């Protein structure tokens, strides 16, 4: 997320035993990084 110039990153790692779809459980995500970059971001792409 980008809020008032703050780029906030949240994440959680959890095991699974299925490759069909996403598990129907419930899990909260903790904050990990908060970078005060202040950049106008409108587009993105991933790198594999």
């Amino acid at each position: 997320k980008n809020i008032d110039g703050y780029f906030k990153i949240y994440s959680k790692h959890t095991p699974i035993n299925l490759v069909r779809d996403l598990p129907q459980g419930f899990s909260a995500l903790e904050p990990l990084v908060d970078l005060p970059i202040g950049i106008n971001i409108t587009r993105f792409q991933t790198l594999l």
Partner: antibody, heavy 119, light 110 residues
Framework: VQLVQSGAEVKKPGSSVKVSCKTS????????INWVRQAPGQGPEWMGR????????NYAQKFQGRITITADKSTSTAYMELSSLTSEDTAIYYC??????????????WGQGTLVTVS | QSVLTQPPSASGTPGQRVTISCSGS????????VNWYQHLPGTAPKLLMS???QRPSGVPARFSGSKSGTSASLAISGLRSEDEADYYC???????????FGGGTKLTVL
């Protein structure tokens, strides 16, 4: 409301059985239907559920493609199909409803149950 | 077998309190909530406690629950004769991706 299901069924091993659970009119949309069985001398165990508005289904892992759950919107009835019946398949089957806007399920209202015996 | 461990039987005297414990593991009890049910043979079950601290709409002031670590307990005060029934504890299991139920207990009142 109330959920009314089919009566007791008696059937032979190796075949399939079909069980219905008729419900009210307003109990679709933001409401899911869950199936729970209770073997004699055993606790309840969950089989699966279906959300009629999204026509998506979930199945228990230890049922490896043995259970099928379907429903029709026009009549507002849900169907249960179980094949490859064996001697150990004897149990009592329940139909129960769930509210969809809650993270972990909590079954709130239950049917009176139907008994299936195999001999 | 039930992933949640529960004593098979419990007994109590009229007018006093009795506590029923339901023990699980970190994967299910340590991560999810517990639910309590009543069952009378020949009828349909009911709700006693939801979300581990939230009382349902109908049940009278009497049934009480608490949770601690990987175990949970249900406390009944002002016991009366109509309380004779079967109690169940249930919870979600993240490792199994399904609902797991306990074995149930039978309460007897002298």
């Amino acid at each position: 409301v109330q959920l009314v299901q089919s009566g007791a069924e008696v059937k032979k091993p190796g075949s399939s059985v079909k069980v219905s659970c008729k419900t009210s009119g307003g109990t679709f949309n933001s409401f899911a239907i869950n199936w729970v069985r209770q073997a004699p001398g055993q606790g309840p165990e969950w089989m699966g559920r279906v959300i009629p508005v999204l026509e998506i289904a979930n199945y228990a892992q230890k049922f490896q493609g043995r259970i099928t759950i379907t429903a029709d919107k026009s009549t507002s009835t849900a169907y249960m199909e179980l094949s490859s019946l064996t001697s150990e398949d004897t149990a009592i089957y329940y139909c129960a409803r769930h509210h969809i806007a809650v993270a972990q399920p909590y079954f709130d209202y239950w049917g009176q149950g139907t008994l299936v015996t195999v001999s | 077998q039930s992933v949640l461990t529960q004593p098979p039987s419990a007994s109590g005297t009229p007018g006093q309190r009795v506590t029923i414990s339901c023990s699980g593991s970190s994967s299910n009890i340590g991560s999810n909530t517990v639910n309590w049910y009543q069952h009378l043979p020949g009828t349909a079950p009911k709700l006693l406690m939801s979300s581990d601290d939230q009382r349902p709409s109908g049940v009278p002031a009497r049934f009480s629950g608490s949770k601690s670590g990987t175990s949970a307990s249900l406390a009944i005060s002002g016991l009366r004769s109509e309380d004779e029934a079967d109690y169940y504890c249930a919870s979600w299991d993240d490792r199994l991706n399904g609902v797991v139920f306990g074995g149930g207990t039978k309460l007897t009142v002298l």
